[PDB]
Each structure stands twice: as structure tokens, then as C-alpha cells.
Amino acid sequence: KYKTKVPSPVVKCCGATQCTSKPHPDYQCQVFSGVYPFMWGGAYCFCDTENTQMSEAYVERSEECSIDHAKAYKVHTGTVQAMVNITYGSVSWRSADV
């Protein structure tokens, strides 16, 4: 299972920032226009229409990958071995790998 981490966006309050693709798995970026965010304190910056937001997200391995994960294998002929146990005459049972 994946986990889609979302880095904190940037808000270039007035003006615009463009974004640059980065070597991350299934990276996505998209600059939005005229955001006008509001935070707990106020309106996060002044100019009503000219406020952009980075909004980049990129997906990575989930932490549970270290514990549960399907492994894909290409299987070849390999070898065959057995455990056998032998008794002959008076000798008691003796076992070994072969």
C-alpha cells in the first residue's frame, strides 16, 4: 500500500510562482490562482485575486511496507531434497537429509 505524502504548499501572496517537476514517484504539481486563503489569524494575505498555491503531492512507500508486502518472484527449477530415515537389520532408526 502506498502513502501519498503532501508537502506543505507555498502561498506566494501577490504574484505567482510556477512549479518544476522533481524526481519523485508520480509527482504532481499545480499552481492555482486567486486562492485567498484564510487561517486562524486572518486572511493570510492582502491582494484578493493575485494569490497562488503550490499544492504538490507525491506518493511513496507506506510504513507498513516494511511488515506486509507482496513479493514477486520468478521461479526456476531449483533442487529437490528430502529427509529420510533408514533402519536395516539390528540398527535402529537413523535419519538424515539427502
For 11-51, the DSSP string reads --SSS-------SSTT-B---BSS---B-SSSBS-S-TT--
Among 18, 20, 38, 90, binds other proteins (CB under 8 A): 38
Residue type, 47: C
- Which residue lies nearer to other proteins by CB, 69 or 94? 69
- Which residue lies nearer to other proteins by CB, 6 or 84? 6
The nearest distance, CB 81 to ligand NAG, in angstroms, is 15
The nearest distance, CB 91 to ligand NAG, in angstroms, is 12
Beta bridge mates, 85: 95
C-alpha span between 70 and 62 (Å, rounded):
13
86 binds, among ligand NAG, other proteins, none (CB under 5 to 8 A by kind): none
Residues 6+ apart with CB under 8 A from 67: none
Positions touching other proteins (CB under 8 A) are 1-4, 6-13, 17, 25-26, 28-30, 32, 35-47, 53-70
